[PDB]
């Protein structure tokens, strides 16, 4: 200890802390004058992820999907099972992409930034879709099913084979909800969901790109890896699961809470309506819904990002 | 050019698949059997993780073992008992006699 009159003074304390940190850094950190960083062939987690930002992203997305969890529980070293599965998925994706490139890019004649832009655009798109649906209380409404056309009504009624009920709300909700039977109020597997979506899109004549399709398929596979209960508990609903898994430090926490509060207090008093009484209503609902969809393109220019604007134009 | 480079990539990925298979085998054969239990793990956490947790302390290169010694500066009235004072009064100076002997 120094021969000063007051070693317990704040100046001394802060000096000791700064010296502590500087010493530990000079000793452990990877620098141009390294002390401990030497004879490195197998790196630890921190240095590995700091040097290879590509692996941190992949190892992190796999962790959040394979195990629905928070980044705060990110493991120090991943399991070899996870690593092998990642390698297999990479092989699949790159095989598809290489075939497509071979057949297109040659007949024609910085990855971090691209990945960042892709992810930003995708999260903006999904946020906009969620907001559009919450505008009419169609975002997360289960066991209910929203409908805006007689075609969709018949399609979703074929689920329960005509059984179930139909509920409505007055002239401010622009869609009608359908309640199947308690035995069929289940949730479907993600592979089945993706297959249904792609089948509907290809029947309508609007197929996704092959790369995006493979992305959806790998996402569904890593979700299947969760097992039986992949999204919800037995006596739990999708909205409860969303509020459960929702990051508390997320800025949209209060927004989602408000939306779900309003949706609950509305569905609690929602009225029942028979089948034929909706189709005639579903006609005008489809009309005003296509009108709102046309307005949506301009609405994106109002507050949407430059990416959404330019992609809409 | 095009064909040769694309075939180079394809064989690179074949080698990758081979490496992955041998990696899986090595792990599930040797390492899953030789893996330590965790009872004798390292009894500490890295300073970076502690700093992120908000748990790191830096000070006290020294320590005070006994509470009698810890609470001296807080008692303000009896930092040392009477017996301890009488014992301390015997070491007001160093003993050059004992040194010499």
């Amino acid at each position: 200890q120094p021969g000063v009159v007051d070693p317990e003074a704040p100046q001394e304390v802060e000096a000791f802390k700064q010296a502590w940190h500087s010493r530990m850094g000079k000793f452990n950190d990877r620098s141009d004058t390294p002390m401990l960083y030497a004879y490195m062939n197998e790196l630890p987690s921190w240095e590995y992820y700091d040097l290879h930002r590509s692996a941190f992203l992949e190892h992190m997305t796999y962790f959040l999907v394979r195990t629905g969890g928070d980044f705060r529980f990110f493991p120090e070293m991943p399991p070899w099972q996870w690593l092998a599965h990642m390698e297999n998925l990479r092989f699949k994706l790159l095989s598809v992409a290489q075939s497509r490139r071979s057949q297109l890019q040659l007949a024609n004649l910085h990855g971090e930034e691209y990945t960042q832009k892709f992810l930003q655009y995708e999260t903006e798109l999904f946020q906009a879709c969620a907001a559009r649906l919450m505008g009419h209380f169609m975002f997360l409404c289960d066991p209910f099913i929203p409908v805006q056309s007689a075609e969709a009504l018949s399609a979703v009624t074929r689920v329960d084979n005509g059984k179930g009920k139909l509920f409505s709300l007055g002239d401010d909700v622009n869609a009608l909800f359908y309640l199947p039977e308690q035995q069929r109020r289940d949730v479907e597997r993600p592979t089945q969901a993706v297959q249904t979506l792609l089948g509907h899109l290809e029947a309508t004549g609007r197929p996704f790109n092959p790369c995006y399709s493979e992305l959806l398929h790998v996402h569904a596979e890593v979700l299947e890896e969760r097992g039986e209960h992949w999204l919800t508990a037995p006596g739990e609903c999708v909205s409860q699961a969303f509020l459960r898994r929702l990051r508390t430090d997320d800025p949209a926490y209060e927004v989602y809470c408000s939306y779900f509060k309003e949706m609950y207090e509305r569905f609690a008093g929602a009225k029942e309506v028979s089948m034929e009484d909706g189709r005639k209503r579903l006609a005008t609902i489809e009309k005003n819904a296509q009108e709102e969809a046309a307005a949506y393109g301009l609405a994106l220019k109002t507050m949407g990002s430059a990416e959404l604007a330019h992609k809409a134009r | 050019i095009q064909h040769w480079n694309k075939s180079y990539e394809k064989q690179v990925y074949s080698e990758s698949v081979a490496l992955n298979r041998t990696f899986q085998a090595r792990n599930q054969l040797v390492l899953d059997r030789l893996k330590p239990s965790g009872a004798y793990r390292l009894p500490a956490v890295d300073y970076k993780r502690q700093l992120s947790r908000g748990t790191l302390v830096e000070g006290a290169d020294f320590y005070l073992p006994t509470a009698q010694e810890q609470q001296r500066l807080a008692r303000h009235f009896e930092p040392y008992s009477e017996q301890e004072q009488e014992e301390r009064r015997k070491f007001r100076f160093q003993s050059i006699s004992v040194y010499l002997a």
Binding site: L51, S54 | L19
Partner: peptide
């Protein structure tokens, strides 16, 4: 020094 590419040894 950080990069977006991973070598064979560090794969």
């Amino acid at each position: 020094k950080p990069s977006w590419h991973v070598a064979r040894e560090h794969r």
